[PDB]
Amino acid sequence: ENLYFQGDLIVSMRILGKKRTKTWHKGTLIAIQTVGPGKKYKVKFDNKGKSLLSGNHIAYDYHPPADKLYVGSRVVAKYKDGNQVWLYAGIVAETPNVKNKLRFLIFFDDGYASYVTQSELYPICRPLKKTWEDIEDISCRDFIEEYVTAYPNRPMVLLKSGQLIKTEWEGTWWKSRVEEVDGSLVRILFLDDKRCEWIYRGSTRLEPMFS
Ligand SMILES: COc1cc2nc(NCCCCCN(C)C)nc(NCCCCCCN(C)C)c2cc1OC
Numbered sequence: 001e002n003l004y005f006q007g008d009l010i011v012s013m014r015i016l017g018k019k020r021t022k023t024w025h026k027g028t029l030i031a032i033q034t035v036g037p038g039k040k041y042k043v044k045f046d047n048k049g050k051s052l053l054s055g056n057h058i059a060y061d062y063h064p065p066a067d068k069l070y071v072g073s074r075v076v077a078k079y080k081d082g083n084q085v086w087l088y089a090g091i092v093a094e095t096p097n098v099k100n101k102l103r104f105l106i107f108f109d110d111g112y113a114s115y116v117t118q119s120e121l122y123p124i125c126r127p128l129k130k131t132w133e134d135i136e137d138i139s140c141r142d143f144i145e146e147y148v149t150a151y152p153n154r155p156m157v158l159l160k161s162g163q164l165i166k167t168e169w170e171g172t173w174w175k176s177r178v179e180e181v182d183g184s185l186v187r188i189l190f191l192d193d194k195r196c197e198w199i200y201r202g203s204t205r206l207e208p209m210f211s
Contacts, residue, residue: 003032016059017043024076024087055126056134064123072148074127077106078120091144100183109135113200156201157208159186166207
């Protein structure tokens, strides 16, 4: 059937949709279609394209209050490396507290981690019951499942700037150094190529956590 209404979704509403690039883009919900329990959402993207999307591949074009965001909430968050300024899917790992200076920790689907503010977050419209089950990468997916379900039990390694440690990259250990800690995140310098990465201090990519 064609629906005009589904939960708090209404045809002709402005919405974010997931493109095949895995980045999310502003569009218009132009149809809702049912097939038994199954629901699909037809989006007309503002620049280029129509897609027929699952409810977990559309996001509201508003910022939720803090009260509607939990550890495990499925979100789209802004990420910015220079002029590359894009919306990507992730999971809320941490809600605002004194220790994180009232920020949201996001674990992106691609294994990047970042603190963001409310103004950087959009809620996914129809997340899965197990929010993490639509993370394509199995190792990220299994990690987030364990993290979210054990929360607030979070083994983390206490690290200090200058500390020499082994960090995982593409399935091997690399000589590295702790450059900076910011709440639950450590900035690791890989000594081989002199590049940095922000890593969750409870990640098994940190050899001390792994052991
Ligand atoms: C803003 O500051 C940073 C931005 C970085 N951006 C990228 N890339 C852009 C891809 C974005 C992904 C999008 N996702 C979230 C959806 N990468 C970084 N570091 C890569 C690590 C290489 C280590 C390599 C180690 N050797 C041994 C191979 C970055 C570090 C940064 O801080 C120090």
